[PDB]
Ligand binder design. Structure first.
Ligand SMILES: N[C@@H](CCC(=O)N[C@@H](CS)C(=O)NCC(=O)O)C(=O)O
Ligand SMILES: N[C@@H](CCC(=O)N[C@@H](CS)C(=O)NCC(=O)O)C(=O)O
Lengths: 206, 205
């Protein structure tokens, strides 16, 4: 029996996607949530001095995309071919580039950096969202099954669902002219094992 | 299988995929576009952006996804899913490192204007220190020389090409880091790679 240990801060952020995979796979795992004092003590012995970090039977593995992709492959949420897996990878990286775009706004709301909320919303967030959902909608209208790629759940379905669900907490008007994305968020998060995890995980904002 | 790579007339984020095709001895259509031509094809690309790989018609965007896909097909991904995950981790850490030095990188090559000397010492070299700190760590853990496992993986290409490119603009890049310099040499000494280096279009960056 493989023993999985996930180490990240007491928040969903970039560690949640890995957590949702463990829930969907019905896989027991050690969910370590650290504070600023405790992270400082372990930081020097982490691959890149950063979290999330996955430990598979001792072996450390950093970087959320690499963690989620690895765990997706093991439990079969990566895609049903290497090309589909590549296309799934592409949506995940496009999502990452989209997070770089809205960093300015995202860190302001939660209060990790100083900024003006209202102009960053209309001038940075919504424009990035428009462009991003434009590509997302394009994948959904190409999909008969509902999922972002192929005819089954893949780990990027989790990434995108969780982000939109999270963003609705801060910006209620996020999915207005985009019913395909809203449908998608609902479809994914309606999955009992996922919903169960949503209902019983530590209520952190973001 | 017929491979078609579409990107601008430069190495940038398309080179890694190109070096894999060379190392696999694989023929491929290397399309290099200009600003007029990109505008004409842009609307029909997955995310309106290049590089884009086409495998027998099927489009695939994003350089990391392209390089990883091509690595898996020809066997430069890693010899297990975990090793592949560790290889993925170094590639993403490299990407985060490029986000750090974007301010500096675009300034030197001249895609934007900026304060060049301060950006060097206050942004570039600090990011490099931290990054090579992790890189050296992996190299001193490696008996074979390669960044991960006992054989070449696509991140060995990414890291070699970047350091070779950066020496063009900043000659003092690899001074207190012989492990990285030796790594750059080891990778770029590989005949099929060297041959590609010697016969590819000489673009700066
Ligand atoms: N691309 C990395 C980013 C990880 C990252 O930046 N983690 C942050 C979470 S806020 C961290 O470790 N922050 C502490 C610090 O280094 O200041 C990943 O997704 O794993
Ligand atoms: N995350 C992508 C980014 C690709 C990228 O930066 N593309 C730029 C190259 S300058 C581009 O397509 N620019 C023209 C445009 O999209 O307008 C990757 O590296 O795979």
């Amino acid at each position: 029996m493989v023993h999985y240990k996930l180490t990240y801060f007491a928040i969903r952020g970039a560690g949640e996607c890995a957590r949702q995979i463990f829930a969907l796979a019905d896989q027991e795992f050690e969910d370590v949530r650290l504070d600023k004092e405790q992270f400082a003590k372990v930081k020097p012995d982490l691959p890149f001095g950063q979290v999330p970090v996955l430990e598979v039977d001792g072996k450390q593995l950093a970087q959320s995309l690499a963690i989620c992709r690895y765990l997706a492959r093991q439990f079969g949420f990566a895609g049903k071919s290497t090309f589909d897996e590549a296309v799934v990878d592409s949506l995940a990286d496009q999502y990452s580039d989209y997070r770089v775009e809205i960093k300015s706004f995202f860190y302001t709301v939660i209060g990790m950096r100083e900024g003006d909320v209202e102009q960053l919303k209309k001038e940075v967030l919504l424009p990035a969202r428009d462009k991003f959902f434009g590509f997302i909608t394009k994948f959904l209208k190409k999909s008969p099954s509902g999922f972002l790629v192929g005819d089954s759940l893949t780990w990027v379905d989790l990434l995108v669902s969780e982000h939109n669900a999270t963003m609705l907490t801060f910006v209620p008007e996020f999915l207005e002219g985009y019913p395909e994305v809203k449908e998608h968020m609902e479809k994914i998060r309606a999955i009992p094992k996922l919903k169960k995890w949503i209902e019983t995980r530590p209520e952190t904002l973001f």
